[PDB]
Amino acid sequence: YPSILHPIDHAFNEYFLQHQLVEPLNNDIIFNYIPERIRNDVNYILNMD
Amino acid sequence: NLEELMRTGDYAQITNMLLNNQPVALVGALPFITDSSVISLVAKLDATV
Amino acid sequence: QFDFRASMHMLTSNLTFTVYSDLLAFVSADTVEPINAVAFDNMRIMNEL
């Protein structure tokens, strides 16, 4: 999108745009988020429905 | 072994085999529906259970 | 002084996405019957039964 910004305002907004904290989320990430010793425990059945 | 499957509760193998149409034999005391309809057999209903 | 050339920028971002906080809400977790629960050595936790 076009924008009119002072160079300082542009610097701040461009830093916010270029350095966002969001990462892609997939089922592999969620699976690895579970503790690795609970994923390997046979007493717990974990599924991605 | 359906008994082992129910005890452990892990359906990964059975799900993989059913989704991939891999021939298998589910072994365990099971109740069954007796059907005398020829049209049901032609319709291949037994494979939909 | 306001210079249009120096102030006109193109801001680039993503069209849309959804941010999720509770990753573990995506995991369907069940547990075996307590009678059948086993310890790290693959034997039942309580064997006196």
mmCIF file of N, CA and C in Angstrom:
data_model
loop_
_atom_site.group_PDB
_atom_site.id
_atom_site.type_symbol
_atom_site.label_atom_id
_atom_site.label_comp_id
_atom_site.label_asym_id
_atom_site.label_seq_id
_atom_site.Cartn_x
_atom_site.Cartn_y
_atom_site.Cartn_z
ATOM 1 N N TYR A 1 0.827 -1.197 0.000
ATOM 2 C CA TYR A 1 0.000 0.000 0.000
ATOM 3 C C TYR A 1 0.866 1.253 0.000
ATOM 4 N N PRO A 2 0.470 2.304 -0.718
ATOM 5 C CA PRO A 2 1.178 3.581 -0.581
ATOM 6 C C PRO A 2 0.928 4.218 0.776
ATOM 7 N N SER A 3 1.913 4.988 1.232
ATOM 8 C CA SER A 3 1.809 5.687 2.503
ATOM 9 C C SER A 3 2.633 6.964 2.447
ATOM 10 N N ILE A 4 2.177 7.976 3.179
ATOM 11 C CA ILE A 4 2.919 9.216 3.382
ATOM 12 C C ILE A 4 3.400 9.219 4.822
ATOM 13 N N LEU A 5 4.716 9.259 5.004
ATOM 14 C CA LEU A 5 5.303 9.138 6.327
ATOM 15 C C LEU A 5 6.570 9.972 6.394
ATOM 16 N N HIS A 6 6.806 10.577 7.549
ATOM 17 C CA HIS A 6 8.095 11.180 7.811
ATOM 18 C C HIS A 6 9.156 10.081 7.860
ATOM 19 N N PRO A 7 10.402 10.383 7.478
ATOM 20 C CA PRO A 7 11.437 9.340 7.530
ATOM 21 C C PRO A 7 11.555 8.649 8.878
ATOM 22 N N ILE A 8 11.360 9.366 9.985
ATOM 23 C CA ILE A 8 11.371 8.725 11.297
ATOM 24 C C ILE A 8 10.150 7.828 11.460
ATOM 25 N N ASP A 9 8.977 8.334 11.075
ATOM 26 C CA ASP A 9 7.768 7.523 11.137
ATOM 27 C C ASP A 9 7.892 6.305 10.238
ATOM 28 N N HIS A 10 8.439 6.495 9.038
ATOM 29 C CA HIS A 10 8.658 5.362 8.152
ATOM 30 C C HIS A 10 9.626 4.368 8.769
ATOM 31 N N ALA A 11 10.684 4.854 9.416
ATOM 32 C CA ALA A 11 11.636 3.948 10.042
ATOM 33 C C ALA A 11 10.950 3.083 11.087
ATOM 34 N N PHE A 12 10.146 3.705 11.950
ATOM 35 C CA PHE A 12 9.455 2.947 12.989
ATOM 36 C C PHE A 12 8.485 1.940 12.384
ATOM 37 N N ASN A 13 7.663 2.386 11.435
ATOM 38 C CA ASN A 13 6.660 1.502 10.855
ATOM 39 C C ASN A 13 7.307 0.369 10.072
ATOM 40 N N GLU A 14 8.403 0.655 9.371
ATOM 41 C CA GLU A 14 9.104 -0.375 8.619
ATOM 42 C C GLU A 14 9.777 -1.370 9.550
ATOM 43 N N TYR A 15 10.291 -0.910 10.692
ATOM 44 C CA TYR A 15 10.813 -1.861 11.664
ATOM 45 C C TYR A 15 9.705 -2.760 12.186
ATOM 46 N N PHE A 16 8.531 -2.188 12.453
ATOM 47 C CA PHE A 16 7.413 -3.007 12.908
ATOM 48 C C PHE A 16 7.000 -4.016 11.844
ATOM 49 N N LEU A 17 7.013 -3.607 10.575
ATOM 50 C CA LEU A 17 6.594 -4.503 9.502
ATOM 51 C C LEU A 17 7.615 -5.607 9.258
ATOM 52 N N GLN A 18 8.902 -5.270 9.284
ATOM 53 C CA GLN A 18 9.942 -6.221 8.919
ATOM 54 C C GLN A 18 10.272 -7.200 10.036
ATOM 55 N N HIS A 19 9.926 -6.879 11.280
ATOM 56 C CA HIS A 19 10.348 -7.641 12.450
ATOM 57 C C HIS A 19 9.143 -8.066 13.275
ATOM 58 N N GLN A 20 8.140 -8.623 12.607
ATOM 59 C CA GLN A 20 6.977 -9.152 13.301
ATOM 60 C C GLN A 20 7.328 -10.448 14.021
ATOM 61 N N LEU A 21 6.642 -10.692 15.135
ATOM 62 C CA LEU A 21 6.942 -11.822 16.005
ATOM 63 C C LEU A 21 6.206 -13.098 15.624
ATOM 64 N N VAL A 22 5.370 -13.067 14.605
ATOM 65 C CA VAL A 22 4.549 -14.218 14.245
ATOM 66 C C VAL A 22 5.359 -15.156 13.364
ATOM 67 N N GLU A 23 5.268 -16.452 13.656
ATOM 68 C CA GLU A 23 5.868 -17.515 12.875
ATOM 69 C C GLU A 23 4.771 -18.418 12.325
ATOM 70 N N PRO A 24 5.008 -19.086 11.195
ATOM 71 C CA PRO A 24 4.013 -20.039 10.692
ATOM 72 C C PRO A 24 3.759 -21.158 11.689
ATOM 73 N N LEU A 25 2.501 -21.579 11.769
ATOM 74 C CA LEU A 25 2.071 -22.629 12.679
ATOM 75 C C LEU A 25 1.541 -23.802 11.871
ATOM 76 N N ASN A 26 2.067 -24.992 12.146
ATOM 77 C CA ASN A 26 1.609 -26.218 11.511
ATOM 78 C C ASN A 26 1.514 -27.302 12.574
ATOM 79 N N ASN A 27 0.990 -28.463 12.178
ATOM 80 C CA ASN A 27 0.777 -29.534 13.144
ATOM 81 C C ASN A 27 2.093 -30.116 13.638
ATOM 82 N N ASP A 28 3.146 -30.055 12.824
ATOM 83 C CA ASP A 28 4.452 -30.515 13.282
ATOM 84 C C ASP A 28 4.968 -29.649 14.425
ATOM 85 N N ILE A 29 4.766 -28.333 14.336
ATOM 86 C CA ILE A 29 5.193 -27.442 15.411
ATOM 87 C C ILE A 29 4.437 -27.758 16.694
ATOM 88 N N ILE A 30 3.126 -27.979 16.596
ATOM 89 C CA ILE A 30 2.348 -28.289 17.790
ATOM 90 C C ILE A 30 2.783 -29.623 18.375
ATOM 91 N N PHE A 31 3.025 -30.616 17.519
ATOM 92 C CA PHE A 31 3.479 -31.912 18.007
ATOM 93 C C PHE A 31 4.808 -31.785 18.735
ATOM 94 N N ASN A 32 5.753 -31.037 18.164
ATOM 95 C CA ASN A 32 7.024 -30.818 18.842
ATOM 96 C C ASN A 32 6.872 -29.949 20.081
ATOM 97 N N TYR A 33 5.776 -29.199 20.191
ATOM 98 C CA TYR A 33 5.545 -28.396 21.385
ATOM 99 C C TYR A 33 5.211 -29.269 22.586
ATOM 100 N N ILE A 34 4.601 -30.427 22.356
ATOM 101 C CA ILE A 34 4.327 -31.341 23.468
ATOM 102 C C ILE A 34 5.654 -31.817 24.040
ATOM 103 N N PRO A 35 5.801 -31.964 25.358
ATOM 104 C CA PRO A 35 7.078 -32.448 25.891
ATOM 105 C C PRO A 35 7.457 -33.792 25.290
ATOM 106 N N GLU A 36 8.745 -33.937 24.980
ATOM 107 C CA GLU A 36 9.201 -35.087 24.209
ATOM 108 C C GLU A 36 9.040 -36.389 24.980
ATOM 109 N N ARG A 37 8.989 -36.324 26.312
ATOM 110 C CA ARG A 37 8.829 -37.527 27.119
ATOM 111 C C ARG A 37 7.371 -37.908 27.324
ATOM 112 N N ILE A 38 6.438 -37.000 27.051
ATOM 113 C CA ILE A 38 5.025 -37.352 27.059
ATOM 114 C C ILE A 38 4.588 -37.877 25.697
ATOM 115 N N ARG A 39 5.235 -37.425 24.622
ATOM 116 C CA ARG A 39 4.968 -37.990 23.307
ATOM 117 C C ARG A 39 5.431 -39.436 23.221
ATOM 118 N N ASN A 40 6.476 -39.791 23.962
ATOM 119 C CA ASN A 40 7.013 -41.143 23.967
ATOM 120 C C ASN A 40 6.383 -42.029 25.031
ATOM 121 N N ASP A 41 5.484 -41.493 25.849
ATOM 122 C CA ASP A 41 4.824 -42.287 26.874
ATOM 123 C C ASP A 41 3.640 -43.023 26.266
ATOM 124 N N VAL A 42 3.588 -44.340 26.481
ATOM 125 C CA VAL A 42 2.517 -45.152 25.908
ATOM 126 C C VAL A 42 1.213 -45.037 26.676
ATOM 127 N N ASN A 43 1.234 -44.458 27.874
ATOM 128 C CA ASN A 43 0.015 -44.285 28.649
ATOM 129 C C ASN A 43 -0.835 -43.130 28.151
ATOM 130 N N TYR A 44 -0.313 -42.315 27.240
ATOM 131 C CA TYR A 44 -1.015 -41.161 26.702
ATOM 132 C C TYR A 44 -1.088 -41.285 25.191
ATOM 133 N N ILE A 45 -2.295 -41.172 24.653
ATOM 134 C CA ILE A 45 -2.544 -41.243 23.221
ATOM 135 C C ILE A 45 -2.795 -39.820 22.752
ATOM 136 N N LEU A 46 -1.884 -39.300 21.940
ATOM 137 C CA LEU A 46 -1.952 -37.938 21.434
ATOM 138 C C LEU A 46 -2.276 -37.981 19.950
ATOM 139 N N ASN A 47 -3.270 -37.197 19.538
ATOM 140 C CA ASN A 47 -3.707 -37.166 18.153
ATOM 141 C C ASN A 47 -3.879 -35.722 17.718
ATOM 142 N N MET A 48 -3.796 -35.511 16.409
ATOM 143 C CA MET A 48 -3.960 -34.198 15.796
ATOM 144 C C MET A 48 -5.218 -34.261 14.938
ATOM 145 N N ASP A 49 -6.369 -34.002 15.559
ATOM 146 C CA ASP A 49 -7.659 -34.027 14.882
ATOM 147 C C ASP A 49 -8.078 -32.645 14.398
ATOM 148 N N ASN B 1 -4.628 -57.303 16.502
ATOM 149 C CA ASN B 1 -5.308 -57.789 17.697
ATOM 150 C C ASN B 1 -6.168 -56.666 18.260
ATOM 151 N N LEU B 2 -7.489 -56.839 18.207
ATOM 152 C CA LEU B 2 -8.380 -55.781 18.668
ATOM 153 C C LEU B 2 -8.298 -55.594 20.175
ATOM 154 N N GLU B 3 -7.985 -56.654 20.919
ATOM 155 C CA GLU B 3 -7.826 -56.515 22.361
ATOM 156 C C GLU B 3 -6.635 -55.628 22.695
ATOM 157 N N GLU B 4 -5.495 -55.866 22.043
ATOM 158 C CA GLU B 4 -4.327 -55.021 22.266
ATOM 159 C C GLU B 4 -4.604 -53.593 21.819
ATOM 160 N N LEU B 5 -5.327 -53.433 20.710
ATOM 161 C CA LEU B 5 -5.667 -52.098 20.231
ATOM 162 C C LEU B 5 -6.535 -51.353 21.239
ATOM 163 N N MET B 6 -7.526 -52.033 21.820
ATOM 164 C CA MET B 6 -8.373 -51.387 22.818
ATOM 165 C C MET B 6 -7.600 -51.100 24.098
ATOM 166 N N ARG B 7 -6.723 -52.018 24.507
ATOM 167 C CA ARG B 7 -5.959 -51.816 25.732
ATOM 168 C C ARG B 7 -5.022 -50.624 25.602
ATOM 169 N N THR B 8 -4.229 -50.587 24.532
ATOM 170 C CA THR B 8 -3.279 -49.497 24.351
ATOM 171 C C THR B 8 -3.967 -48.224 23.878
ATOM 172 N N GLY B 9 -4.979 -48.348 23.028
ATOM 173 C CA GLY B 9 -5.683 -47.196 22.516
ATOM 174 C C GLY B 9 -4.987 -46.468 21.389
ATOM 175 N N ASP B 10 -3.857 -46.976 20.906
ATOM 176 C CA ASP B 10 -3.135 -46.364 19.798
ATOM 177 C C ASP B 10 -3.684 -46.908 18.486
ATOM 178 N N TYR B 11 -4.310 -46.036 17.696
ATOM 179 C CA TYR B 11 -4.958 -46.426 16.451
ATOM 180 C C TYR B 11 -4.152 -46.004 15.229
ATOM 181 N N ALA B 12 -2.860 -45.725 15.405
ATOM 182 C CA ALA B 12 -2.044 -45.268 14.287
ATOM 183 C C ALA B 12 -1.940 -46.339 13.209
ATOM 184 N N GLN B 13 -1.615 -47.571 13.604
ATOM 185 C CA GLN B 13 -1.439 -48.639 12.626
ATOM 186 C C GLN B 13 -2.743 -48.946 11.906
ATOM 187 N N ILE B 14 -3.832 -49.095 12.660
ATOM 188 C CA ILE B 14 -5.102 -49.464 12.049
ATOM 189 C C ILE B 14 -5.611 -48.340 11.158
ATOM 190 N N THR B 15 -5.444 -47.089 11.588
ATOM 191 C CA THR B 15 -5.839 -45.967 10.744
ATOM 192 C C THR B 15 -5.023 -45.933 9.461
ATOM 193 N N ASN B 16 -3.712 -46.150 9.564
ATOM 194 C CA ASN B 16 -2.871 -46.148 8.374
ATOM 195 C C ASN B 16 -3.272 -47.262 7.418
ATOM 196 N N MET B 17 -3.604 -48.437 7.953
ATOM 197 C CA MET B 17 -3.982 -49.553 7.092
ATOM 198 C C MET B 17 -5.345 -49.326 6.453
ATOM 199 N N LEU B 18 -6.292 -48.756 7.199
ATOM 200 C CA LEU B 18 -7.622 -48.527 6.647
ATOM 201 C C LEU B 18 -7.602 -47.426 5.597
ATOM 202 N N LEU B 19 -6.827 -46.366 5.833
ATOM 203 C CA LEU B 19 -6.775 -45.266 4.877
ATOM 204 C C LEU B 19 -6.043 -45.664 3.604
ATOM 205 N N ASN B 20 -5.080 -46.576 3.701
ATOM 206 C CA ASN B 20 -4.280 -46.996 2.561
ATOM 207 C C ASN B 20 -4.821 -48.244 1.877
ATOM 208 N N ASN B 21 -5.963 -48.765 2.322
ATOM 209 C CA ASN B 21 -6.567 -49.955 1.727
ATOM 210 C C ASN B 21 -5.589 -51.125 1.716
ATOM 211 N N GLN B 22 -4.904 -51.326 2.835
ATOM 212 C CA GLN B 22 -3.951 -52.416 2.963
ATOM 213 C C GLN B 22 -4.656 -53.628 3.557
ATOM 214 N N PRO B 23 -4.680 -54.780 2.879
ATOM 215 C CA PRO B 23 -5.441 -55.917 3.409
ATOM 216 C C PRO B 23 -4.984 -56.290 4.810
ATOM 217 N N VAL B 24 -5.951 -56.570 5.680
ATOM 218 C CA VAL B 24 -5.681 -56.829 7.089
ATOM 219 C C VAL B 24 -6.743 -57.786 7.614
ATOM 220 N N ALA B 25 -6.530 -58.283 8.830
ATOM 221 C CA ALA B 25 -7.500 -59.120 9.526
ATOM 222 C C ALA B 25 -7.605 -58.624 10.960
ATOM 223 N N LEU B 26 -8.739 -58.024 11.303
ATOM 224 C CA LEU B 26 -8.995 -57.589 12.671
ATOM 225 C C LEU B 26 -9.472 -58.795 13.468
ATOM 226 N N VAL B 27 -8.667 -59.226 14.437
ATOM 227 C CA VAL B 27 -8.884 -60.471 15.164
ATOM 228 C C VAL B 27 -9.384 -60.141 16.561
ATOM 229 N N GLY B 28 -10.476 -60.766 16.949
ATOM 230 C CA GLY B 28 -11.067 -60.574 18.257
ATOM 231 C C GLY B 28 -12.547 -60.882 18.196
ATOM 232 N N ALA B 29 -13.084 -61.333 19.327
ATOM 233 C CA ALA B 29 -14.501 -61.659 19.419
ATOM 234 C C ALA B 29 -15.342 -60.443 19.062
ATOM 235 N N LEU B 30 -16.071 -60.528 17.952
ATOM 236 C CA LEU B 30 -16.808 -59.407 17.403
ATOM 237 C C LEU B 30 -18.263 -59.793 17.182
ATOM 238 N N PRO B 31 -19.206 -58.886 17.419
ATOM 239 C CA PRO B 31 -20.577 -59.128 16.974
ATOM 240 C C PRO B 31 -20.735 -58.737 15.516
ATOM 241 N N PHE B 32 -21.603 -59.460 14.816
ATOM 242 C CA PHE B 32 -21.772 -59.269 13.384
ATOM 243 C C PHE B 32 -23.249 -59.185 13.033
ATOM 244 N N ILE B 33 -23.533 -58.488 11.937
ATOM 245 C CA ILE B 33 -24.886 -58.321 11.422
ATOM 246 C C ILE B 33 -25.091 -59.326 10.301
ATOM 247 N N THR B 34 -26.052 -60.227 10.471
ATOM 248 C CA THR B 34 -26.371 -61.207 9.443
ATOM 249 C C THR B 34 -27.295 -60.557 8.422
ATOM 250 N N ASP B 35 -26.875 -60.558 7.160
ATOM 251 C CA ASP B 35 -27.611 -59.922 6.077
ATOM 252 C C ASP B 35 -27.870 -60.939 4.978
ATOM 253 N N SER B 36 -29.125 -61.033 4.546
ATOM 254 C CA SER B 36 -29.528 -61.967 3.506
ATOM 255 C C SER B 36 -29.845 -61.285 2.184
ATOM 256 N N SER B 37 -29.664 -59.971 2.090
ATOM 257 C CA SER B 37 -30.032 -59.232 0.891
ATOM 258 C C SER B 37 -28.921 -59.335 -0.144
ATOM 259 N N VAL B 38 -29.268 -59.808 -1.341
ATOM 260 C CA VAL B 38 -28.301 -59.851 -2.432
ATOM 261 C C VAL B 38 -27.951 -58.441 -2.883
ATOM 262 N N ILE B 39 -28.931 -57.538 -2.870
ATOM 263 C CA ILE B 39 -28.687 -56.169 -3.310
ATOM 264 C C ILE B 39 -27.696 -55.484 -2.383
ATOM 265 N N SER B 40 -27.749 -55.798 -1.088
ATOM 266 C CA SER B 40 -26.769 -55.248 -0.158
ATOM 267 C C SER B 40 -25.368 -55.743 -0.483
ATOM 268 N N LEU B 41 -25.237 -57.023 -0.834
ATOM 269 C CA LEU B 41 -23.935 -57.553 -1.220
ATOM 270 C C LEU B 41 -23.426 -56.887 -2.492
ATOM 271 N N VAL B 42 -24.304 -56.695 -3.476
ATOM 272 C CA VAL B 42 -23.905 -56.006 -4.700
ATOM 273 C C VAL B 42 -23.488 -54.576 -4.388
ATOM 274 N N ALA B 43 -24.175 -53.937 -3.442
ATOM 275 C CA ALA B 43 -23.849 -52.576 -3.041
ATOM 276 C C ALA B 43 -22.550 -52.488 -2.255
ATOM 277 N N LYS B 44 -21.981 -53.618 -1.839
ATOM 278 C CA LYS B 44 -20.687 -53.645 -1.160
ATOM 279 C C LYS B 44 -20.768 -52.964 0.204
ATOM 280 N N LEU B 45 -21.862 -53.210 0.926
ATOM 281 C CA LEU B 45 -22.059 -52.561 2.217
ATOM 282 C C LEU B 45 -21.080 -53.072 3.264
ATOM 283 N N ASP B 46 -20.667 -54.337 3.166
ATOM 284 C CA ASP B 46 -19.760 -54.899 4.161
ATOM 285 C C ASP B 46 -18.453 -54.125 4.235
ATOM 286 N N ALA B 47 -18.036 -53.511 3.133
ATOM 287 C CA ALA B 47 -16.789 -52.762 3.102
ATOM 288 C C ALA B 47 -16.922 -51.362 3.682
ATOM 289 N N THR B 48 -18.126 -50.946 4.069
ATOM 290 C CA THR B 48 -18.378 -49.590 4.536
ATOM 291 C C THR B 48 -18.513 -49.495 6.050
ATOM 292 N N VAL B 49 -18.136 -50.539 6.785
ATOM 293 C CA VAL B 49 -18.362 -50.611 8.222
ATOM 294 C C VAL B 49 -17.083 -50.375 9.014
ATOM 295 N N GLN C 1 11.070 20.896 5.372
ATOM 296 C CA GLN C 1 10.007 21.034 4.389
ATOM 297 C C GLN C 1 9.456 19.668 4.007
ATOM 298 N N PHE C 2 8.168 19.638 3.687
ATOM 299 C CA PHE C 2 7.531 18.411 3.237
ATOM 300 C C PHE C 2 7.898 18.161 1.781
ATOM 301 N N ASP C 3 8.530 17.022 1.519
ATOM 302 C CA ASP C 3 8.872 16.588 0.172
ATOM 303 C C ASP C 3 8.077 15.326 -0.121
ATOM 304 N N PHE C 4 7.241 15.373 -1.158
ATOM 305 C CA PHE C 4 6.399 14.223 -1.466
ATOM 306 C C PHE C 4 7.238 13.015 -1.853
ATOM 307 N N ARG C 5 8.288 13.226 -2.646
ATOM 308 C CA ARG C 5 9.110 12.106 -3.089
ATOM 309 C C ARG C 5 9.769 11.407 -1.908
ATOM 310 N N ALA C 6 10.230 12.174 -0.922
ATOM 311 C CA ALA C 6 10.905 11.593 0.229
ATOM 312 C C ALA C 6 9.947 10.940 1.214
ATOM 313 N N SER C 7 8.657 11.276 1.161
ATOM 314 C CA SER C 7 7.686 10.768 2.120
ATOM 315 C C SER C 7 6.816 9.648 1.571
ATOM 316 N N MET C 8 6.759 9.471 0.256
ATOM 317 C CA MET C 8 5.934 8.427 -0.334
ATOM 318 C C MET C 8 6.675 7.100 -0.251
ATOM 319 N N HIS C 9 6.102 6.147 0.478
ATOM 320 C CA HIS C 9 6.669 4.817 0.628
ATOM 321 C C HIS C 9 5.622 3.778 0.263
ATOM 322 N N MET C 10 6.088 2.552 0.058
ATOM 323 C CA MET C 10 5.232 1.392 -0.154
ATOM 324 C C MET C 10 5.410 0.474 1.047
ATOM 325 N N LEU C 11 4.359 0.333 1.845
ATOM 326 C CA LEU C 11 4.380 -0.545 3.004
ATOM 327 C C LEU C 11 3.863 -1.916 2.597
ATOM 328 N N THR C 12 4.626 -2.954 2.929
ATOM 329 C CA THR C 12 4.335 -4.320 2.517
ATOM 330 C C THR C 12 4.067 -5.175 3.745
ATOM 331 N N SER C 13 2.998 -5.962 3.691
ATOM 332 C CA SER C 13 2.660 -6.880 4.771
ATOM 333 C C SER C 13 1.958 -8.089 4.168
ATOM 334 N N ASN C 14 1.456 -8.967 5.027
ATOM 335 C CA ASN C 14 0.682 -10.116 4.587
ATOM 336 C C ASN C 14 -0.782 -9.730 4.441
ATOM 337 N N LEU C 15 -1.469 -10.407 3.524
ATOM 338 C CA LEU C 15 -2.873 -10.091 3.293
ATOM 339 C C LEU C 15 -3.720 -10.437 4.511
ATOM 340 N N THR C 16 -3.456 -11.578 5.142
ATOM 341 C CA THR C 16 -4.212 -11.978 6.320
ATOM 342 C C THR C 16 -3.583 -13.224 6.921
ATOM 343 N N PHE C 17 -3.793 -13.399 8.223
ATOM 344 C CA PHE C 17 -3.497 -14.656 8.897
ATOM 345 C C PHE C 17 -4.177 -14.630 10.257
ATOM 346 N N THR C 18 -4.209 -15.793 10.903
ATOM 347 C CA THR C 18 -4.805 -15.952 12.223
ATOM 348 C C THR C 18 -3.735 -16.419 13.195
ATOM 349 N N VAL C 19 -3.595 -15.703 14.306
ATOM 350 C CA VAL C 19 -2.594 -16.000 15.323
ATOM 351 C C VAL C 19 -3.252 -16.820 16.421
ATOM 352 N N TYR C 20 -2.616 -17.926 16.793
ATOM 353 C CA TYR C 20 -3.125 -18.826 17.817
ATOM 354 C C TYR C 20 -2.208 -18.794 19.029
ATOM 355 N N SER C 21 -2.804 -18.861 20.218
ATOM 356 C CA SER C 21 -2.064 -18.819 21.472
ATOM 357 C C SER C 21 -1.959 -20.181 22.139
ATOM 358 N N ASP C 22 -3.066 -20.912 22.242
ATOM 359 C CA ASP C 22 -3.078 -22.207 22.919
ATOM 360 C C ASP C 22 -2.812 -23.289 21.882
ATOM 361 N N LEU C 23 -1.535 -23.635 21.714
ATOM 362 C CA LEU C 23 -1.181 -24.704 20.788
ATOM 363 C C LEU C 23 -1.728 -26.043 21.257
ATOM 364 N N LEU C 24 -1.646 -26.318 22.558
ATOM 365 C CA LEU C 24 -2.068 -27.613 23.071
ATOM 366 C C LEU C 24 -3.569 -27.829 22.952
ATOM 367 N N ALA C 25 -4.342 -26.778 22.674
ATOM 368 C CA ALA C 25 -5.757 -26.956 22.382
ATOM 369 C C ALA C 25 -5.978 -27.703 21.077
ATOM 370 N N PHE C 26 -4.962 -27.780 20.224
ATOM 371 C CA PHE C 26 -5.044 -28.490 18.959
ATOM 372 C C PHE C 26 -4.751 -29.976 19.095
ATOM 373 N N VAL C 27 -4.408 -30.445 20.290
ATOM 374 C CA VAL C 27 -4.012 -31.828 20.519
ATOM 375 C C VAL C 27 -5.144 -32.532 21.249
ATOM 376 N N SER C 28 -5.635 -33.619 20.663
ATOM 377 C CA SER C 28 -6.603 -34.493 21.313
ATOM 378 C C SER C 28 -5.825 -35.515 22.128
ATOM 379 N N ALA C 29 -5.885 -35.393 23.448
ATOM 380 C CA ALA C 29 -5.122 -36.241 24.348
ATOM 381 C C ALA C 29 -6.070 -37.136 25.129
ATOM 382 N N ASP C 30 -5.806 -38.438 25.091
ATOM 383 C CA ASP C 30 -6.541 -39.427 25.859
ATOM 384 C C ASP C 30 -5.538 -40.256 26.644
ATOM 385 N N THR C 31 -6.039 -41.052 27.583
ATOM 386 C CA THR C 31 -5.181 -41.881 28.414
ATOM 387 C C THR C 31 -5.763 -43.281 28.510
ATOM 388 N N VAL C 32 -4.875 -44.264 28.629
ATOM 389 C CA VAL C 32 -5.275 -45.659 28.760
ATOM 390 C C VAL C 32 -6.005 -45.826 30.083
ATOM 391 N N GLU C 33 -6.682 -46.956 30.256
ATOM 392 C CA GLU C 33 -7.299 -47.242 31.539
ATOM 393 C C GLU C 33 -6.221 -47.261 32.620
ATOM 394 N N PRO C 34 -6.493 -46.725 33.814
ATOM 395 C CA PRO C 34 -5.450 -46.726 34.851
ATOM 396 C C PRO C 34 -4.942 -48.114 35.185
ATOM 397 N N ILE C 35 -5.778 -49.139 35.033
ATOM 398 C CA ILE C 35 -5.346 -50.504 35.313
ATOM 399 C C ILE C 35 -4.194 -50.894 34.395
ATOM 400 N N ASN C 36 -4.226 -50.429 33.149
ATOM 401 C CA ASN C 36 -3.266 -50.833 32.132
ATOM 402 C C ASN C 36 -2.054 -49.918 32.045
ATOM 403 N N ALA C 37 -1.990 -48.865 32.854
ATOM 404 C CA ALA C 37 -0.876 -47.932 32.774
ATOM 405 C C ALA C 37 0.431 -48.633 33.116
ATOM 406 N N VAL C 38 1.457 -48.384 32.307
ATOM 407 C CA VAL C 38 2.762 -49.004 32.478
ATOM 408 C C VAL C 38 3.784 -47.928 32.815
ATOM 409 N N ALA C 39 4.892 -48.366 33.400
ATOM 410 C CA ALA C 39 5.987 -47.493 33.778
ATOM 411 C C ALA C 39 7.049 -47.501 32.680
ATOM 412 N N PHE C 40 8.188 -46.862 32.952
ATOM 413 C CA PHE C 40 9.230 -46.735 31.940
ATOM 414 C C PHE C 40 9.765 -48.083 31.483
ATOM 415 N N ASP C 41 9.641 -49.120 32.305
ATOM 416 C CA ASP C 41 10.146 -50.443 31.976
ATOM 417 C C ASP C 41 9.110 -51.312 31.276
ATOM 418 N N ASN C 42 8.028 -50.716 30.776
ATOM 419 C CA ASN C 42 6.991 -51.382 29.997
ATOM 420 C C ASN C 42 6.158 -52.351 30.822
ATOM 421 N N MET C 43 6.373 -52.413 32.131
ATOM 422 C CA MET C 43 5.546 -53.189 33.040
ATOM 423 C C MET C 43 4.571 -52.258 33.747
ATOM 424 N N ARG C 44 3.487 -52.835 34.253
ATOM 425 C CA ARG C 44 2.454 -52.026 34.884
ATOM 426 C C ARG C 44 3.002 -51.318 36.116
ATOM 427 N N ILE C 45 2.489 -50.112 36.364
ATOM 428 C CA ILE C 45 2.971 -49.317 37.490
ATOM 429 C C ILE C 45 2.692 -50.040 38.800
ATOM 430 N N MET C 46 1.481 -50.567 38.949
ATOM 431 C CA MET C 46 1.078 -51.321 40.131
ATOM 432 C C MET C 46 0.710 -52.726 39.679
ATOM 433 N N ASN C 47 1.508 -53.711 40.093
ATOM 434 C CA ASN C 47 1.358 -55.085 39.636
ATOM 435 C C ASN C 47 0.680 -55.993 40.650
ATOM 436 N N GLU C 48 0.477 -55.538 41.887
ATOM 437 C CA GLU C 48 -0.223 -56.370 42.859
ATOM 438 C C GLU C 48 -1.661 -56.621 42.433
ATOM 439 N N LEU C 49 -2.285 -55.649 41.776
ATOM 440 C CA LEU C 49 -3.630 -55.811 41.240
ATOM 441 C C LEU C 49 -4.610 -56.219 42.333
#
